Amino acid sequence: IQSLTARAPVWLAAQDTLNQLCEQSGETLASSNDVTEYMQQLLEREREATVERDEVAAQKRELEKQIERLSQPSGAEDSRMIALAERFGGVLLSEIYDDITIDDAPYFSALYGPARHGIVVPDLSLVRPHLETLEDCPEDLYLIEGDPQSFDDSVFNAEEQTNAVLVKSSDRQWRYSRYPELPLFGRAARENRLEALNLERDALAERYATLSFDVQKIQRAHQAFSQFVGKHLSVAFDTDPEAEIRE
Amino acid sequence: ITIDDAPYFSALYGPARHGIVVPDLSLVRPHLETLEDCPEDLYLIEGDPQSFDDSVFNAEEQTNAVLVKSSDRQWRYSRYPELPLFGRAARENRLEALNLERDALAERYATLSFDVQKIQRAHQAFSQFVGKHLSVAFDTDPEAEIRE
Amino acid sequence: LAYMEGGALRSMSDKALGALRLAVADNEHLRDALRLSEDPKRPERKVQFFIAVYQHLRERIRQDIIRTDDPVDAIEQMEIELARLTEELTAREQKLAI
Hints:
- This is part of a larger assembly, with 3 copies of chain A.
- The first copy, chain A, is mainly α.
- Chain A has 8 helices and 6 strands, in the order H-H-H-E-H-H-E-H-E-E-E-E-H-H.
- In chain A, 55% of the residues lie in helices and 11% in strands.
- In chain A, helix 1 runs antiparallel to helix 7 (189-232) and helix 2 packs antiparallel against helix 7 (189-232).
- Chain A is rod-shaped, with a radius of gyration of 33 Å.
- Chains in contact: A-B, A-C.
- Strand 3 (140-144) of chain A pairs antiparallel with strand 5 (74-79) of chain B.
- Chain C: This is Chromosome partition protein MukB.
């Protein structure tokens, strides 16, 4: 009786800890081997959830990068377009066409092509010296000549076609710009579209948070099981003393 | 095309780097309205595919860059890219380097998997011991008590 | 604890009450219930205090975004909320900067 009594409290605390740990799970444990397979299932769920979480995070990061790219000063290639714009007494072409209608925006964007984002500089000789210096700039920088405040439409070999525009960029060379959707020009409702991107990313962030919480919960369950087994295995699944002591 | 001038050719061509050498230009205009899946800024040039004459540019070479009079009141500045569209030569050594990195990752994964296998085996041995010899584990020798 | 003498139980209870003193400093109703609970001739008050804890812990659940009636199971939901609010804080900081 005294030996069983001495053994008792350890066994009782072990039983209570094990019952709490198992009930926290949907399963009830019955063996050390069974605990090992539960650990294996925990590892499987963890290695899965982490992959989904990372995939969602990559999608998320792409979404915020896209949202930022449309931010300032007027959503464009502002990484270097900024310095390229204020360093010279010019104005962004996209900003110049900032207020164009959503309907004329695709037409003008197709008409202007890769030069939509160009910078208006009436001289073209201010950039002539600095050209050699420019090593950190978009692989294709675009500049146009005219009055930034009242620039006259760039003369083009344009040829409008159904929802598109052909153009002769140089002798024997044509660029065919199909009417884009949600264009560069007309950057007033494009702010509304980056708001729509924020709305879209809201659900992505919600799902990422759920996945991260699941990962944390699985990690904490695994750590609790580890601590358990550290303190617990010696008496796990052993016979009940209380009944023996009463008998 | 040579690796040396390939970045130069890419910088000179710009977005027109990706283009089709159609010496007629007559199959496009009727089909132009018929092109919908084509890239939005489709680029087409007139030249002989057998001997494509050098494309027309008013090109000035700056240090690792170029300036081209793309059109009236339009001067375009470009820099030299890497892995240019021209002179690909299949760039097979880049594929090989990527394969080397992937194979190194696979080898590392194999080694880690083997280590995990060994650790699992040791765990199962420990579990087996504690399942069958835990009760008498570390306890004293009964032979002395028996002799006493 | 069924196999531990009363003196050690008194000692653990004393230590726990000392901790509760600091823990419940802010609250007034829980503090008053605790201040009542130490009379040794009214044991049920102690039990009541526990109820008063859980009860209180339930009303302040802010069930608008939480559901678990048991506060012990709401720690996960608060952790979820902290993670979500950290994300929202990052977004807000970026927006303010721009």
